[PDB]
Design a protein around this ligand. Structure first.
Ligand SMILES: [Mg+2]
Ligand SMILES: [Mg+2]
Ligand SMILES: [Mg+2]
Ligand SMILES: [Mg+2]
Ligand SMILES: [Mg+2]
Ligand SMILES: [Mg+2]
Ligand SMILES: [Mg+2]
Ligand SMILES: [Mg+2]
Ligand code: NA
Ligand code: NA
Ligand code: NA
Ligand code: NA
Ligand code: NA
Ligand code: NA
Ligand code: NA
Ligand code: NA
Lengths: 1011, 1011
């Protein structure tokens, strides 16, 4: 049979799901979480062979190793080993939509392993094999005999091997199919890979054993008392001497215990469960678990005899916390959460979808270090270790079933069909059975982008009945269907409604108060971090803090799914969709992270960190008011540092410890300051520093900051007297001005400053010209494609309007000599096909001091698409090591993404002024700048700028960062104004009106001088 | 594979479920529900062979008929043909409980059929086979090639044979397994049979076809306006030229119509169902459907090209009705129902579980003629014609999923197990998909006696999402769980609580008001009609009428499940559990019907008819107030007949047309009546008669009656003197009295009347003695067995106290001669092992008129269990043809089951005075009798009696009615007092206290005379 083309068969001979087991045979090791000799890993070197279809696998493989197989590491995705290509498709299925069939050319991975077992395992007990993750479906044989089959690439599939085992060498043969009917439920937006990608193990349990256990914690009104209730189930022969004891430990101290024989309460007319027992433990003043203080206890479940012999033990970490929705609010331990969440796929640039402890830890540390307190398992149950880490390090988790049918038309075609209820059910039920005891899991999710089908309603109900301790959410079909306890839209905007038929995305503030609505609202996905993005992030935060029922959301997403490829040289580079010959593909849409694949942050990460701070501040006079947003912990590892600076120059600073209760406030009166009558703006910067290291941060970690302008002293003094006067030399073709060893040349045909010299040294490679466009950001492009243009996209709108192609017609170019200067006046019109898009009017005033003051007045046609920027650009001859500026920084910042940047004097190496987005675009801009220094040059004004060795033209024409080459000299883009970058989504225009350049008339001025 | 030992495989290659199709190619034939040339029946003669296990079937059978096969009729249950035995087990499974496995010895039925297929069916379109019922699982081969597999004995399994058939002769091969994993969900209390027991048919559909259609009817506030909405789905060639036209007809008039192209509304981000269309038809003043007036329209669903070519048409009967629960009440068309329901299994004494039109009709007529308006499909979907019939004749139906796991321990072991969710889902979903357009179905049920599992919660929700038009109910787990919209207990009593742990059965009146409860309460099963039962029926009806939220119930059950067996002589006899060698078995527990297996009524039927009347009456002076309980109809086929009689002698009578609106009242003042001087009691009897025949009844059918005592003239008349005095003659052994041609002999050693002569003919075969016991009723025995006594059962309590074996000890016997009479006085004590149980003191006064007056005063020890009766008995020498009595009748009636009986003078053949319950017991009693005539004898008094050719001893000792033998003479039991019969259930004592003989002292008197 082709069990892989039949949704009614999702497994054969598979054992029931259950929470993590180790079959410890020693209570103290179980207590300590130490290794169990009854649980062995079979990870390591296996033998593998790839085939084009299951029909090509030779029968001989069942009995013996194929000489042509290779030895490979398991776990692994075979594409990562180069056997076939990974495919990056977003919504459209990677296979023909024809349920339940799959391609007859179905890549098949034949894995095998030779192994043996302890003699005692041949003697007695049950030995099972556990495959934590096999993508997408597989058949298993042991010593040539068929064992079973399994589907669901994201949950463990276990089989009893007891009767197949033999003395000596044994051989497993695992036939893995790339595609199966399970693939119709695995349409997540990510690389499409396959293989045995999570752990493989053997677990030796007794025949009379703990087959399942559920831990629940209920509380009194003030959480000062709890009842821990643990239902324990057994398999095997019941005997009157058996007992179960459940003990609760706080570290090495036993705090509570309960023992009882098997036999549950009567539950119906036929009696009760003779094979279960529920123990109830009273716990006084329990230490509560939260992401803020992940307090944990240890529960040890022992199956033993009345007379004291242990048969076996199981165990888990227990977090005492209550999750409930009441009055429209999601409460944890009675307090309303504010979710600083992120969606996180399991992705590694070299290993594909194989997760390792080091990586998970790294991600958790970075998440916490960047003020995240929650994660959504987009969009499947994760590797088991993730939950352990989240329980211990403390992050709220949304555990999500591995069901995504995005590519169907309409999206609920399968989810509304009863024939698919069975396969879907297991993806939900087996997840709960496995994960229900992890305290970090606070919400269950039914899957993602599968429309809204009756199967969802049935499953929603099943979970609510089986585990009332956690709310259930699901975004499909409109985000507020009968299958979700939380309104949980993806990409709904803060103030702006997007009233799509059937499934509108209302402004989140409006959504809450729709007639009859009362649920809390937490975005399952928001702030699409694709390339230069995160524009408008602060808008969300502000709303979340203002509206009780807006309880946060999960950013999309943590890490870019870029894959490493190698060039002819052996040099690695980041690859995206299509880079493997995969087609159709969705190009750079797999890169939406706050961090690059290797975990290096993108600039947007700081913006997120700042907006998600846990301390709020207000300034009044000299009093700084600090407000704690923590719900549970006191600020016991924080100090406030403050500093006052005059235009970058340090004037004063100090420190004061924070001593604020959760939700409390603290007033700090700044000492009396000094009075510098020296002109300039004074600025106050405060930072919260954690003096002590923690399990997730180093000593000195900065967790929050904020700045304010203090007194300003406008300069009223006149600059020193003009020693000299510059000379004008005219030709039909140029206006040349000379001053000392300095010269400026203005082309009279083009009307631009075409050259400048310090001595005989030329300073420009390209003339100084107005610039109205930018190499488009991913948000500017959306889903627009050459092949399939989206005319509504920003980029398309600017192309169609001719912005990229308009030519500067000269309207006027004059020169006047003044008393102590030369004044050049210019006027240009940029037109397109006869339409004048923009008019720039300028004056350049060069005086005896050698400074060139530029004044620019631009007019933009009201009917042309608002332009990406309004500035000047040129290629300087010079290449200098550093960039020093007085403005916002130090990192890249844009108008709608600069709240995290601070105003001060920064100085970085030039390359730091370039942001290496894998898909290149305008980047590295810094706003609010009053002075910029590079080499001998100094520009002053109130502008935005970027500076790098790459032209806007080069960035726009180059699809991968590894292909960029430094140009001669340095490209400087100085803007009077720059359009926001947007990001509410990356497939429709998202830059908010206030960050669009629509004023029609714009003015700016700059002074260019040397030194 | 052993697919039949795997709950994960419930079918292979089976087509989707859908409502009844016929694929008409002419719309008028569809409109008329005439036969379709595209839907053929394959019922008829098939070939069959029985095997002890599937492993015994020879491979040749796939390719050709087995010479040893027999030709048999299909559909059939093979047990009915004698291949193996049917098994009658109630709760305990017929197989070892070891899910999901079955016995390796598993009776296999090999059916085959060679049949014809016309080439035209194969030139185009699709040809499918449909098996309406195969118990319990089967594999299908066509022309030697494997086609597929199916489970669920009670719904249709359809397979596409398009590619397997060829023009001309074709051969099917069906391997039917008696046991499969489906059996774990098929543990209903009925005979365990197997085979192809529902219709087999062949359906041709076009390639582009109607694959499903759902019809809904929504109304305005007063039901004066409706919108019929029909969603239609297609499969096949989707093109712009297709259209759907739905037309609605009332008779030959088209009332509405709509046409539309395919493509439903947008449902989500991926669009809508391009293969679906919803038509909405407005209908003004629709004729509403109810069980009272089953008004129907015909909807024709035409799939056609826009230019006019009908592709195919499907159609259904539509009943405009709304079902909804509001404010705690179940309403139909806005009015609260009162369910006069009955549970009905599909059972035929000769054909087993095979149903036929005639039988169904016969049952529906009798149900209606007996004032039932509702039926519950206990406990599985029914043969398809049942629904058509309830739609047309008018009965409300509870459609029930084929899920019963009663024998599990605890009962929800499988239903709370997610691994059984898929198998259960199919049973619920496919039922709804098939029966959702039938107006008769008003409530869906999740199955029966399967405890309460999370699977039920999930499924409850699925239905509520897919079909909001009908409430969902389910009794398991305590009858008021979260999986039921209706409190639907089985056997909860009216006033008496039964507080079992976990699943108590509260009094129904108390249940409605438990803190927080608001749902309506309708018993899914009540009034267990096993043997002589239905005692207490009236108590239920009084509560139902009194409490709004008590909306009725469904009696258990309609027809006894007895099977015909043939004796040596070839005479048929009714058999029950164990009569086929089947063991273990549950004996007579399969017979619980209001009617015998051949549809002959049991006496309880008339009690149900009466209590379930649709007209209530009150009498005030000579005014009769009639109140209608109809909700929607006027009494347009009814007249009131009234009659007054003096002790059975007709005095006056009349008829008055009834004209009452639904829920209305009518007052009818009767004529000045007879006030006769003559002694006796005047009795008024009124009957409601339907003058015109209907679809379900004959002209003159009586639908209701009631009686009242009017004036009573007590006799004060002295009997004239007798020209005679009886003479006494004594001896040590006897007292003999003679008077004219009459003689009486009283034995002085026994203390009883041992003989009487009329003329010179002996009148007694056994002496006249007190009797305190009865041949126990099924309700007296309950579950007690020799092998496992239930000491709480009435029969056991009487046995243990010695009632059945107590011997009369004579305490006194004297004779005295009076003025004009001889008086004999006796006293006897009945003892057991030293305990005096009862004392009987009597006097017999024989006067000169020849009458013998007997006075009896009994004492019953307060500490002995209340006795079954307090009466006398004797075997008369005479056998006479008729029995004439003045008292309640004419049918058998008991203290707690006599409301239906009317007081009058009745006269029946002797044989009618015996009720042939299959399992013999005390029977034929008539209560409230004032005079009894049999042969030359007349007895007068105020007593209850029975009279037949069978002694109480014989009835108690014989297990089956066909084994009873008429004794010499006639046994007469004349009771002063008789215990109620009970019946609230048949497994615990159920006789209400007011019907138990607990007074301690009892007095009765009779006069025995001639004529
Ligand atoms: Mg499959
Ligand atoms: Mg998606
Ligand atoms: Mg593409
Ligand atoms: Mg099966
Ligand atoms: Mg027509
Ligand atoms: Mg043709
Ligand atoms: Mg049952
Ligand atoms: Mg038995
Ligand atoms: Na909030
Ligand atoms: Na993406
Ligand atoms: Na502190
Ligand atoms: Na680019
Ligand atoms: Na009622
Ligand atoms: Na029964
Ligand atoms: Na009438
Ligand atoms: Na009997």
């Amino acid at each position: 049979r082709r069990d892989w083309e039949n949704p009614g068969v999702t497994q054969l001979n598979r054992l029931a799901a259950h929470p993590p087991f180790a079959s410890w045979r020693n209570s103290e090791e179980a207590r300590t979480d130490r290794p169990s000799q009854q649980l062995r890993s079979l990870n390591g070197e296996w033998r593998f062979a790839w085939f084009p279809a299951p029909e090509a696998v030779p029968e001989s493989w069942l009995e013996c190793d194929l000489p042509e197989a290779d030895t490979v590491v398991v776990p692994s995705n075979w594409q990562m080993h180069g056997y076939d290509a990974p495919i990056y498709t977003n919504v459209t299925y990677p296979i023909t939509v024809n349920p339940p069939f799959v391609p007859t050319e179905n890549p098949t991975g034949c894995y095998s392993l030779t192994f043996n077992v302890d003699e005692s395992w041949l003697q007695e007990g049950q030995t099972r094999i556990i495959f934590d993750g096999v993508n997408s479906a597989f058949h298993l044989w042991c010593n040539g005999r068929w064992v079973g089959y399994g589907q669901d690439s994201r949950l463990p599939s276990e089989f009893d091997l007891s009767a197949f085992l033999r003395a000596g060498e044994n051989r497993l043969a695992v036939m893995v199919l790339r595609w199966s009917d399970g693939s119709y439920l695995e349409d997540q937006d990510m690389w499409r890979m396959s293989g045995i990608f999570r752990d493989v193990s053997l677990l030796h349990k007794p025949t009379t054993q703990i087959s399942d256990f559920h831990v629940a914690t209920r509380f009194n009104d003030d959480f000062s008392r709890a009842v821990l209730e643990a239902e324990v189930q057994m398999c095997g022969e019941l005997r009157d001497y058996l007992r179960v004891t459940v003990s609760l430990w706080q570290g090495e101290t036993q705090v509570a215990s309960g023992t009882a024989p098997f036999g549950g309460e009567i539950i119906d007319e036929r009696g009760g469960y003779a094979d279960r027992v529920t123990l109830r433990l009273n716990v006084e003043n329990p230490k509560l678990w939260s992401a803020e203080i992940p307090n944990l206890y240890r529960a040890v479940v022992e199956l033993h005899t009345a007379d004291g012999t242990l048969i076996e033990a199981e165990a888990c970490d227990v977090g005492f916390r209550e999750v409930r929705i009441e009055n429209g609010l999601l409460l944890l331990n009675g307090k309303p959460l504010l979710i600083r969440g992120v969606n996180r796929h399991e992705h590694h640039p070299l290993h594909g979808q194989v997760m390792d402890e080091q990586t998970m830890v790294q991600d958790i540390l970075l998440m916490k270090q960047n003020n995240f307190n929650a994660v959504r398992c987009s969009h499947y149950p994760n590797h088991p270790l993730w939950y352990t880490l989240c329980d211990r390090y403390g992050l709220y988790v949304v555990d999500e079933a591995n069901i995504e049918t995005n590519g169907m038309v309409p999206m609920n075609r399968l989810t509304d069909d009863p024939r698919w209820l069975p396969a879907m059910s297991e993806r939900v039920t087996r997840m709960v059975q496995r994960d229900r005891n992890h305290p970090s899991v606070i919400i269950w999710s039914l899957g993602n982008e599968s429309g809204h089908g009756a199967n969802h309603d049935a499953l929603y109900r099943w979970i609510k009945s089986v585990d009332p301790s956690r709310p259930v959410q699901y975004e499909g079909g409109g985000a507020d269907t009968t299958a979700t306890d939380i309104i949980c839209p993806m990409y709904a905007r803060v103030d702006e409604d997007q009233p799509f038929p059937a499934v509108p995305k209302w402004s989140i503030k409006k959504w809450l108060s729709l007639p009859g609505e009362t649920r809390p609202l937490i975005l399952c996905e928001y702030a699409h971090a694709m390339g230069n993005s995160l524009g408008g992030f602060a808008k969300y935060w502000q709303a979340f803090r203002q509206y009780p029922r807006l309880q946060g959301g999960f950013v999309w997403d943590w890490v870019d799914q870029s894959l490493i490829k190698y060039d002819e040289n052996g040099n690695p580079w980041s690859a995206y969709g299509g880079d493997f010959g995969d087609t159709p593909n969705d190009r750079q849409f797999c890169m939406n992270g706050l961090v690059f694949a290797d975990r290096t942050p993108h600039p947007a990460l700081t913006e997120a960190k700042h907006q998600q701070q846990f301390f709020q501040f207000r300034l009044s006079g000299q009093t700084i008011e600090v407000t704690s947003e923590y719900l549970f912990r006191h600020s016991d590892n924080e100090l406030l540092h403050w500093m006052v600076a005059l235009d970058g120059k340090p004037l004063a600073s100090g420190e004061v410890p924070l001593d604020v209760a959760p939700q409390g406030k603290q007033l700090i009166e700044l000492p009396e300051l000094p009075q510098p009558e020296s002109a300039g703006q004074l600025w106050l910067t405060v930072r919260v520093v954690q003096p002590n290291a923690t399990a997730w941060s180093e000593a000195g970690h900065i967790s929050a900051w904020q700045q304010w302008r203090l007194a300003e002293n406008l300069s009223v003094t006149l600059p020193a007297a003009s020693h000299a006067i510059p000379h004008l030399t005219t030709s039909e073709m140029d206006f040349c001005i000379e001053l000392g060893n300095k010269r400026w040349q203005f082309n009279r045909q083009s009307g631009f400053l075409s050259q400048m010299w310090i001595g005989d040294k030329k300073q420009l490679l390209t003339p100084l010209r107005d610039q109205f466009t930018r190499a488009p950001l991913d948000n500017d492009i959306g889903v627009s494609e050459a092949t399939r243009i989206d005319p509504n996209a920003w980029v398309e709108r600017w192309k169609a309007a001719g912005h990229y192609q308009a030519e500067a017609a000269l309207l006027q170019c004059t020169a006047d000599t003044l008393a102590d200067a030369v004044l050049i006046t210019t006027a240009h019109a940029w037109q397109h096909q006869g339409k004048t898009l923009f008019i720039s009017r300028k004056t350049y005033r060069i005086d005896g001091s050698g400074q060139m003051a530029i004044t620019v007045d631009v007019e933009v046609a009201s009917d042309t698409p608002h332009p990406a920027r309004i500035g000047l650009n040129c290629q300087l001859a010079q290449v200098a090591e550093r960039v020093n500026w007085l403005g916002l920084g130090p990192q890249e910042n844009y108008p709608d993404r600069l709240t995290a940047a601070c105003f001060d004097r920064w100085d970085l190496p030039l390359s730091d002024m370039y942001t290496p987005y894998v898909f290149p675009s305008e980047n590295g801009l810094r706003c609010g700048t009053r002075e910029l220094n590079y080499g001998p040059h100094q520009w002053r004004g109130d502008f935005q700028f970027n500076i790098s060795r790459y032209s806007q033209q080069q960035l726009m024409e180059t699809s991968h960062r590894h292909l960029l080459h430094a140009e001669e000299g340095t490209w400087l883009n100085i803007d009077g104004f720059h359009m926001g970058i947007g990001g509410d989504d990356s497939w429709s225009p998202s830059v908010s009106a206030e960050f669009q350049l629509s004023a029609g008339r714009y003015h700016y001025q700059l002074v260019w001088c040397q030194k």
